[model samples]
Target: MGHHHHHHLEEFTAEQLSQYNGTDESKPIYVAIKGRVFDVTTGKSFYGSGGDYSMFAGKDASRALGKMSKNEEDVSPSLEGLTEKEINTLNDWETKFEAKYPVVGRVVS
Candidate 1:
């Protein structure tokens, strides 16, 4: 006889896990490249918080949501207008920031 192992995954409903609005029981957000989870709102990992993994200082997925308030002027520069050196500098900063602050979990419920 062959032995088989089954992996049981547990899922939570939206209500049970809240509506993903920065609640403590929100869904687990994971990073595609690093396979790490992060709290969508806080950007902290599920396990801990520290300088090595400070959440709020990088190219987090949440950044897609936008960094400016509705009333604030957009300070972001267009890629077409940037010099090669400027672009490289921006890239280097982003890389360092990501390394210093990685996302590892989400807020649910």
Candidate 2:
């Protein structure tokens, strides 16, 4: 097999990219690759200078990867690779996050 760049920006949908909008609050936006979850919705990866979630943002893959937490900078929810199961999980998480946090930040050019 060959190595692939799963991080390509186009892999995500418009709605998925829109989930990155926010201020200091932590939203439930995650990318699941091969059953692992990575949180790309906060910090330099997404929120830039708005800081990160301590509990879920940087913690181990237990508290926030599969569940929820208060720390907003967690990226452990984001992982590499994608499987059949993860696709559904990512969609579910994104939908739930949007419904709860309807407000999104402005996109800077």
Candidate 3:
């Protein structure tokens, strides 16, 4: 059958998004980038707690993506001081995200 109905996307504040960091087994893992949140639960092995990218879970990694940084301070959503090259890198990551996970929500202030 063809699809007809659609589910509403969620709106999560940064604080609200922090709870889905893979700490709770019942919840899905979420990672935000440039205010867009994606359900990366299927990538649990990488994004889950104690995983390589665990630091990115539940946080907007826009700056990190652009800077190619895994530093704690760069894990925020702000793109204020990014260089052109960094922004380009960020776009690349964004494209990868768009091709993979389903966007479940947006990160609102």
Candidate 4:
């Protein structure tokens, strides 16, 4: 089959990925975890503004997953200082995303 633009993998800058915040109940919600970007539109209630996990919208969730922190500075692409238990927690979140959302693209340098 011919490649579908939306289905094909794309490269995204951190600045570019920040555009998909699930605000005003419009557009898609996208986030990066471990360099992979996922469409989290189906999880609006969680990723949208005012949601408990809203701190992660349009963010590279790699650091938040490993650090399990909502602090703006802690939400990052670095995996430093993660404990074994935190790594496990991040793994579970990764699995959850893999099972629930489609991989739309990747975070690029």
For each candidate in the order shown, give its overall lDDT on alpha carbons.
Answer: 0.31, 0.37, 0.82, 0.75
Supply candidate 2's per-residue lDDT for 41: 51
> How do all the candidates rank in terms of lDDT, highest first?
3, 4, 2, 1
Off by over 4 Å in 4: 1-7, 80-86
Report how far residue 33 has shifted in candidate 3, in Å. Answer: 0.6
Clashes of each: 13, 17, 0, 0
lDDT of 4 by residue, 56-99 (tens): 67877887887778897888756556877887877777888899
Instruction: Give me the candidate number with maximum lDDT.
Output: 3
TM-score of each: 0.27, 0.28, 0.86, 0.78
Superposed Cα deviation of residue 29, candidate 1 (Å):
14
TM-score of 3: 0.86
Candidate 1 lDDT score relative to the true structure: 0.31
Model 3 Cα shift for residue 70 (angstroms): 0.7
lDDT tens digits, residue span 7-87, model 3: 697776777787788877746788898888998888977887668988778888888999998997778877778888889
Better of 2 and 4 by TM-score: 4
Write the residue-wise lDDT of candidate 1 on 24-107 in tens digits: 353343221111222333454431232232222221222211332112122222234445565565455445435644434321
* Model 2 CA deviation exceeding 4 Å by range: 1-80, 103-109
Question: What ranges in model 3 sit over 4 Å off?
Answer: 1-7
TM-score of 2: 0.28
